[PDB]
UniProtKB/Swiss-Prot annotation, chain A:
Acts as a component of the MCM2-7 complex (MCM complex) which is the putative replicative helicase essential for 'once per cell cycle' DNA replication initiation and elongation in eukaryotic cells. The active ATPase sites in the MCM2-7 ring are formed through the interaction surfaces of two neighboring subunits such that a critical structure of a conserved arginine finger motif is provided in trans relative to the ATP-binding site of the Walker A box of the adjacent subunit. The six ATPase active sites, however, are likely to contribute differentially to the complex helicase activity. The modification Phosphoserine is found at S205. This is DNA replication licensing factor MCM6. The chain holds residues 103 to 463 of 1017 of the full protein. The lineage of its organism: Eukaryota, Fungi, Dikarya, Ascomycota, Saccharomycotina. Belongs to the MCM family. The gene is MCM6. Component of the MCM2-7 complex. The complex forms a toroidal hexameric ring with the proposed subunit order MCM2-MCM6-MCM4-MCM7-MCM3-MCM5; loaded onto DNA, forms a head-head double hexamer. Interacts with MCM10.
Swiss-Prot record, chain B:
It catalyses: ATP + H2O = ADP + phosphate + H(+). Component of the MCM2-7 complex. The complex forms a toroidal hexameric ring with the proposed subunit order MCM2-MCM6-MCM4-MCM7-MCM3-MCM5; loaded onto DNA, forms a head-head double hexamer. The keyword Repressor does not apply. It comes from Saccharomyces cerevisiae (strain ATCC 204508 / S288c) (Baker's yeast). The gene is MCM4. One of its GO terms (biological process) is pre-replicative complex assembly involved in nuclear cell cycle DNA replication. This is DNA replication licensing factor MCM4. ATP binds at G383, D384, P385, S386, T387, S388, K389, S390. One of its GO terms (molecular function) is ATP hydrolysis activity. The chain holds residues 177 to 838 of 933 of the full protein. It is found in: Nucleus. Disulfide bonds: none annotated. It comes from the Eukaryota. Its EC number is 3.6.4.12.
From Swiss-Prot, chain C:
Component of the MCM2-7 complex. The complex forms a toroidal hexameric ring with the proposed subunit order MCM2-MCM6-MCM4-MCM7-MCM3-MCM5; loaded onto DNA, forms a head-head double hexamer. Interacts with CSM1 and MCM10. GO terms for molecular function: ATP binding; ATP hydrolysis activity; chromatin binding; DNA replication origin binding; MCM complex binding; single-stranded DNA helicase activity. Belongs to the MCM family. The keyword Cell cycle applies. This is DNA replication licensing factor MCM7. The chain holds residues 78 to 385 of 845 of the full protein. It is found in: Cytoplasm; Nucleus. The lineage of its organism: Eukaryota, Fungi, Dikarya, Ascomycota, Saccharomycotina. Keywords: ATP-binding, Cell cycle, Cytoplasm, DNA replication, DNA-binding, Helicase, Hydrolase, Nucleotide-binding, Nucleus, Phosphoprotein. It comes from the Eukaryota. GO terms for cellular component: chromosome, telomeric region; CMG complex; cytoplasm; DNA replication preinitiation complex; MCM complex; MCM core complex; nuclear pre-replicative complex; nuclear replication fork. GO terms for biological process: DNA replication; DNA replication initiation; DNA strand elongation involved in DNA replication; double-strand break repair via break-induced replication; nuclear DNA replication; pre-replicative complex assembly involved in nuclear cell cycle DNA replication; premeiotic DNA replication; silent mating-type cassette heterochromatin formation. Disulfide bonds: none annotated.
UniProtKB/Swiss-Prot annotation, chain D:
Present with 10300 molecules/cell in log phase SD medium. Early fractionation of eukaryotic MCM proteins yielded a variety of dimeric, trimeric and tetrameric complexes with unclear biological significance. The MCM2-7 hexamer is the proposed physiological active complex. Component of the MCM2-7 complex. The complex forms a toroidal hexameric ring with the proposed subunit order MCM2-MCM6-MCM4-MCM7-MCM3-MCM5; loaded onto DNA, forms a head-head double hexamer. Interacts with CSM1. This is Minichromosome maintenance protein 5. Belongs to the MCM family. It comes from the Eukaryota. Disulfide bonds: none annotated. Residues 1-21 are annotated as: Disordered.
Amino acid sequence: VDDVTGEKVREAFEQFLEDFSVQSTDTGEVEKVYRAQIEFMKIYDLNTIYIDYQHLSMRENGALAMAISEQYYRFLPFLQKGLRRVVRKYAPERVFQISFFNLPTVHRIRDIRSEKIGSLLSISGTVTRTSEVRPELYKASFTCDMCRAIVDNVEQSFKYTEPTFCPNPSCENRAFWTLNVTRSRFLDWQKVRIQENANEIPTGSMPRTLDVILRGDSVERAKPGDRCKFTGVEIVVPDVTQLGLPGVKPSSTLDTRGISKTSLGVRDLTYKISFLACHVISIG
Amino acid sequence: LRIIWGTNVSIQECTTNFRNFLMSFKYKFRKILDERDEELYYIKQLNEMRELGTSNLNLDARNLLAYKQTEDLYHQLLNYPQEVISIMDQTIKDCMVSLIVDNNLDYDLDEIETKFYKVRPYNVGSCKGMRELNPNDIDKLINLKGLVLRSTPVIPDMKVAFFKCNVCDHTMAVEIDRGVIQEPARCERIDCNEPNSMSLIHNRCSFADKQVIKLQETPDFVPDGQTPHSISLCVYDELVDSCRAGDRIEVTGTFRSIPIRANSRQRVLKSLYKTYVDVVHVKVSDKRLDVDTSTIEQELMQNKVDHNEVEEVRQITDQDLAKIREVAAREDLYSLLARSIAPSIYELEDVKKGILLQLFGGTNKTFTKGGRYRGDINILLCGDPSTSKSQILQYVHKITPRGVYTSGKGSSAVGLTAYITRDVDTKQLVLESGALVLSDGGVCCIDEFDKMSDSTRSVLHEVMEQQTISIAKAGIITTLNARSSILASANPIGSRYNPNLPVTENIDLPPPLLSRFDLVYLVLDKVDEKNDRELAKHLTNLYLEDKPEHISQDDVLPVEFLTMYISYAKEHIHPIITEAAKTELVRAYVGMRKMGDRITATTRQLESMIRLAEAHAKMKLKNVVELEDVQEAVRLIRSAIKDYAT
Amino acid sequence: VIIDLDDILQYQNEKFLQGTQADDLVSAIQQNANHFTELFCRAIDNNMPLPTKEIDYKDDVLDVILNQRRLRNERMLSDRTNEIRSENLMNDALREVVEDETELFPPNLTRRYFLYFKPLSQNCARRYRISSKPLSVRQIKGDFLGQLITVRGIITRVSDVKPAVEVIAYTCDQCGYEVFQEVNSRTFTPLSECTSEECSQNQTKGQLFMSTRASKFSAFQECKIQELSQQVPVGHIPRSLNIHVNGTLVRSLSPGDIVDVTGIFLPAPYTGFKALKAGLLTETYLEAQFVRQHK
Amino acid sequence: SFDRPEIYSAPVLQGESPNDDDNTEIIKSFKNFILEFRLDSQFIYRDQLRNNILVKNYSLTVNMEHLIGYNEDIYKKLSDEPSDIIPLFETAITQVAKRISILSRAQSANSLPTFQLILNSNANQI
């Protein structure tokens, strides 16, 4: 059902970019133009694609446009999987980033609420106090020493450690890592920290910070003291120091109305809105 | 009979009796008000809720007092907020259903019946302030006053959870309703065994909006010897971004009390609880003081239309608008309005008149690029003491919507902006707004303008000229505007002004900075005898018969016509100062330049004359200026000029 | 309720002259003075003229809570003697049966009031011939801990009034009980699954969470007495001594005054740095009972 | 240097009571079994108990075919897992034994241990 939903959008996406993409005549901007982007990528071997949103706004009469734009974080691996099968059809180790651009309506920092979680949004502000460039794992090779330790695995999502099930061989749940610091696939990311525009703030209060993470292609493209436009996906980061705010803040005491008898591993959770972006254009 | 365990309420009598309230209401609040439109309210306001699509009906409390019966439901409401508010929600929804069965084809009946309707009460008493409150009275409704310092960012709240596994994979979910979230250990796929790992994906679940606003109040009838105080309150979903930094707000809400952890490490919940407020309804506008502008508001006019909210602007009714167009036809409005400002102080009608013209300040013209011309005018007034300088400043401090009152030798260069500090409750570095950013749009006041430093008074060279402030230190490097209308005063060396001495000499200022101020008064005393009889007759007129009667003869004084007169004169007028007066205006300016060979005259006099002139044209409802009335706009400087001869 | 220490002494001279001998009670209060609030207050509660006025509608919330606790307590106590009496097989024995198989709200919780002593003058002690000699803060040796003394000085740094907890009331949601908990210390800890007699001895324990309209609060405010600076030796500096204040007596300590506080003098456990402790150093304070101002 | 706090309870509200026939409210059937039984034409267990209190025997004897006679489901419940259902019957007896003890002793003449049941059948000689 839901896998039929996401797979249905997946085949509609493969069907989308396989077909025509240029409506213009001989005076162009000729056909196709996506296959020129794949093959032009094949000659230089740089492993990204820049696709527009307006062309996808043309075709489906807005039906698929209202299907990626809301639950975007749900639809990474289906999209990236279908694009990988298009590549194995038309091309001969691959890490693909699908960075949209040219969105209709730009919001500020004040229009951020929490009903807009998951979606895409165009944020414009001012870069101040950038940081440096450091790696990140996201490709584990971690299993127990008794005996097999060759399992490629999870921690694409931030946990980090460790692998849980199908262990080890043979040391079962929850025997896990030692990890491996030589068998992985890394990439690099920095964390710039945007500050709100000077010609926008409601008279009268003070400017307001926000954090933002850049992975992959858009490293180093930011500039200290310049305006930017970003890309929307807007994740949630676990936070600590908001205790005694006052609450009432929830907690996660696990259930025991199952297991029959013959400890208190309860937790806290408090979350602050960060932002995650992949395309940086420096118009301003 | 049924009852609830904590209370004495019953669902039947509250429901049917409140239904019996919403069908009959015929101005019994006026029967208490003594009578000095016969159709009831909530059919009309329920239709205004109906066609416009807005939610959020709101009612008073005195209306629940005046009707008999349901004198009982008021005392049920003031004690037990949550349950009674839930009951009134349910019967409002069934009253909408009981309306829609009159015409049967109305608004696609399912969803508009499905949409949540809610109640916001206010005006529920004000007996004793925040200090007196015993811990007997934990959960009630409370009214407060006072301003607002800062505003925390947005923090979410879980309303729905979301779970998966790695086997193989099924995706059940769970709600909150009480304090905690339980999670299952097993299973899905197979359900039963194996007891697989149960993960939580925290990018898929629902959320809410929770904003914390810190407040400081002014609880009149003080418990002597009380000092000021600070409360922290915790607004919710719809009312997020309904409070800036600086407004004067009257709040309702429920007093609460929840313990806090110790050192974020153990479960030792410390005793000696912490208290806060849990707001329900925000009351920004008011009927006694002034009303906010519109050229400032336009960002939150551009917002707040997608989501239905509170009014932020005083609602101009229709009947008294005819009285506005009637009083505008009076000839003597130019001395009537200036006479009716401060009815307890009696001289200086040029000064009262200039203080009236500070409330009508200029025309806000914005260019394509650059420009940004405000309507700021700026007034000094000095002279001998014992001249009631302070009464004027307290009265203007009451009338102004966003006024901030500093003083001399209680200032610093830090003391007007960027109080970057350490907030205690969250233990981070939070930046505060100083004394001019709170003054943003409105009237500031400064006493003893002589006794500043050099560092202070070097702030005002930016605010008076550029109409900016440029903070540049370690927190934030970003300019931020503070439009404001500065009013000040100073006391000379004398203290009596003596003749045959230069006017610039007798007040210790550099005369370029004295030359930068628009309108400079010099109020001195007369040794003659004829006025003082009327003076003492005014004072003993005030002291007598222990009742406020002060001026009723032979004068008509509007009480609160003038505030809506000023606000209506502040939105719907754009005066333009076209061709026919430039001959007289440039002619008088070159005539002013003639004196040369004490004070001088620069281009600030010319900028002064156009902005003061069109400010006079803003009065009396004229979209253009005339060649006539520019003469007395010169004479407001010429009265001081006749006061410069001695 | 102000229970003075003059009516007791006059009662002892009256009973001493009537015959027989009366047991000495005033010095017995002055020596210990902590047991007698609970002993005295459970002496009050046997007899009380209950029904003298019907409840107002608009009275309060604390009244209506204690009224429902009292009424439910009665109906619970009558149900069991409506059950066992119909299973036969003077009636004092059946009362002793029913009164020990039924869990009840204890009378420490349905109280509504407080109780405060009041020390004796020099006038009444002069008429018939100590409990109130006005002492100074230097004079309080560490051998008065427990008695009922009297000081004088200038109040400085009186703080705000904020609620402090006394008993905390949970609900069980499955069994339906109300599990209380008393708190004596500075810091407490919340508790877990249940401790009843029904959610215990079962497999599936419930889970409990608290509520704030059924606990019992009390106002709380602390301040400091500095030495009067007239009763000092030649080369010294004024000291200080803390005061806790509970109950009705709150909001009567204005800063910068001259006051005569009379109260009892207890210990409260602390020592300072960990490397300075020798065991079992105690760090005293002064409870308040009755406040009399000069000026 | 204070003393310890205390924890207690009071039954106020009912209550999630289907009732699911679990560890308690089985004991309701045995307080209904010793007291509220009478075979024709005389109740037999109550008299044996109030007899056994005076001689201080502190025991009780049960016929098991009588248990399948009166009720039916607790019989096979007992024959499933007998090592965990018998001490429930012990507490079920001693709650009644306190009542009969105090009513007999106080009209008209601490401490009392837990009893024991001694059952006996003649069904099937395995």
